[PDB]
Design a protein around this motif. Structure first.
Motif, mmCIF file in Angstrom:
data_model
loop_
_atom_site.group_PDB
_atom_site.id
_atom_site.type_symbol
_atom_site.label_atom_id
_atom_site.label_comp_id
_atom_site.label_asym_id
_atom_site.label_seq_id
_atom_site.Cartn_x
_atom_site.Cartn_y
_atom_site.Cartn_z
ATOM 1 N N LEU A 91 104.646 34.071 13.660
ATOM 2 C CA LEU A 91 105.421 35.251 14.031
ATOM 3 C C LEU A 91 105.533 35.386 15.544
ATOM 4 N N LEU A 92 104.470 35.036 16.272
ATOM 5 C CA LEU A 92 104.515 35.118 17.728
ATOM 6 C C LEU A 92 105.303 33.962 18.332
ATOM 7 N N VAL A 93 105.310 32.803 17.669
ATOM 8 C CA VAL A 93 106.059 31.664 18.187
ATOM 9 C C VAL A 93 107.551 31.839 17.938
ATOM 10 N N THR A 94 107.923 32.526 16.854
ATOM 11 C CA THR A 94 109.338 32.743 16.569
ATOM 12 C C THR A 94 109.938 33.805 17.480
ATOM 13 N N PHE A 95 109.137 34.787 17.901
ATOM 14 C CA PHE A 95 109.647 35.823 18.791
ATOM 15 C C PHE A 95 109.849 35.289 20.204
ATOM 16 N N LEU A 96 108.974 34.383 20.649
ATOM 17 C CA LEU A 96 109.123 33.809 21.981
ATOM 18 C C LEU A 96 110.257 32.794 22.031
ATOM 19 N N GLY A 97 110.465 32.042 20.948
ATOM 20 C CA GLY A 97 111.553 31.078 20.932
ATOM 21 C C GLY A 97 112.915 31.735 20.817
ATOM 22 N N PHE A 98 112.992 32.849 20.087
ATOM 23 C CA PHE A 98 114.261 33.556 19.953
ATOM 24 C C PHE A 98 114.604 34.338 21.215
ATOM 25 N N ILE A 99 113.601 34.680 22.024
ATOM 26 C CA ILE A 99 113.865 35.406 23.262
ATOM 27 C C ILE A 99 114.520 34.491 24.288
ATOM 28 N N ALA A 100 114.094 33.227 24.342
ATOM 29 C CA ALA A 100 114.704 32.283 25.272
ATOM 30 C C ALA A 100 116.086 31.848 24.804
ATOM 31 N N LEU A 101 116.306 31.792 23.488
ATOM 32 C CA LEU A 101 117.620 31.415 22.976
ATOM 33 C C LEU A 101 118.630 32.544 23.138
#
Lengths: 145, 51
Positions: B2-12
């Motif tokens: 959940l924390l890795v998906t929020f950080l990856g979607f923020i950069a995208l």
């Protein structure tokens, strides 16, 4: 004496090319006939004609009648065909620009000053300019047709 | 995850924000340039017809 302005005084139609060429040729031929001819009456040398003729009182009677008055190929200003058509042409062609060209200049100035100006107020002024531009586009296609 | 998906979607979403604004310039901003060019051509045609 409009030289270059008389050749382009007509509209887009080429139907006035025959009428403009006939009017320019008639004015040049009338001015050249008055300059080539003498601007005086006649000499009538009666001093060397009355004493040289064989018949007595022959050259003296013809000189007095020729110096009086005679008929000539002339006319009066009663048949004013071009004068009557001058008032009707200015009332249909020149007078039409006082209401057609004047309305187009006032509509173009109001649309240019409104379309170039903040948000809701500027959009309301642009609506009137868009309607004037749409009417000008239809008038431009009707002027070429 | 959940924390890795929020950080990856923020950069995208940051790179997509610049791409959405640049792609909108060929439709939204291009409409203002097209309307200004059409108004300039209509003003020159109206001035030529009035002259």
């Amino acid at each position: 004496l409009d030289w270059t302005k008389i050749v382009s005084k007509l509209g887009l139609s080429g139907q006035t090319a025959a009428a403009l060429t006939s009017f320019k040729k008639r004015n040049d031929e009338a001015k050249r006939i008055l300059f080539e001819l003498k601007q005086q009456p006649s000499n009538v040398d009666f001093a060397f004609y009355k004493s040289t003729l064989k018949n007595t009182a022959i050259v003296d009677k013809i000189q007095s009648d020729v110096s009086k008055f005679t008929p000539s190929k002339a006319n009066l200003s009663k048949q004013l065909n071009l004068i009557e058509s001058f008032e009707a042409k200015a009332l249909e062609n020149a007078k039409e620009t006082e209401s057609v060209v004047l309305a187009e200049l006032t509509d173009l100035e109001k649309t240019l000053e409104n379309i170039e100006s903040x948000x809701x107020x500027x959009x309301x002024x642009x609506x009137x300019x868009x309607x004037x531009x749409x009417x000008x586009x239809x008038x431009x296609x009707x002027x070429x047709x | 995850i959940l924390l890795v998906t929020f950080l990856g979607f923020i950069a995208l979403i940051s790179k997509t924000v610049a791409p959405l604004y640049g792609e909108m310039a060929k439709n939204r901003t291009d409409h203002v340039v097209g309307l200004l060019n059409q108004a300039r051509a209509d003003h020159v045609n109206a001035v030529k017809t009035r002259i």
